Design a protein around this nucleic acid. Structure first.
Ligand SMILES: [Mg+2]
Ligand SMILES: [Mg+2]
Ligand SMILES: [Mg+2]
Ligand SMILES: [Mg+2]
Ligand SMILES: [Mg+2]
Ligand SMILES: [Mg+2]
Length: 65
RNA sequence: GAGGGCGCUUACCACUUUGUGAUUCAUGACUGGGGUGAAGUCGUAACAAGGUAACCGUAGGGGAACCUGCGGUUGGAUCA
């Protein structure tokens, strides 16, 4: 029942969280503004730095990338 | 002796070889389009007079649907 056997490289490194619109077009680019709101609020629960480097917005709102 | 056989020889002829051409299948850097997409970008050309009535031939032009010229057609509308 011992829990920490293996090692893990890359495991503490910072991420590049990319979110892209799938099927739906203007609405798949409108749920993508709610996955970014899912993880950017999760990264503030445990004190991380979101850094919006590139973002192209949808027509009716959200993010297409 | 006549005649036959063997040999030789010539004629026809299969193998095989050379030249060139047709044709069909495979393939080829690349390129012209075509078809299918439960989402993208740029427009809105068509269907209502679709907001420039559409369309046919042809010609020229333009990212693209197209647009314009000349002729034609009604498979156009409104005529108070
Ligand atoms: Mg139109
Ligand atoms: Mg117009
Ligand atoms: Mg018109
Ligand atoms: Mg027109
Ligand atoms: Mg018409
Ligand atoms: Mg012109």
């Amino acid at each position: 029942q011992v829990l920490l056997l293996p090692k893990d490289p890359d495991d503490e490194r910072n991420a590049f969280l990319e979110v892209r619109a799938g099927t739906g077009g203007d609405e798949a680019a409108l749920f993508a503004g709610d996955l970014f709101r899912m993880y950017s609020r999760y990264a503030e629960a445990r004190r991380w730095r979101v850094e919006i480097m590139s973002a192209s917005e949808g027509e009716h709102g959200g993010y297409k990338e």
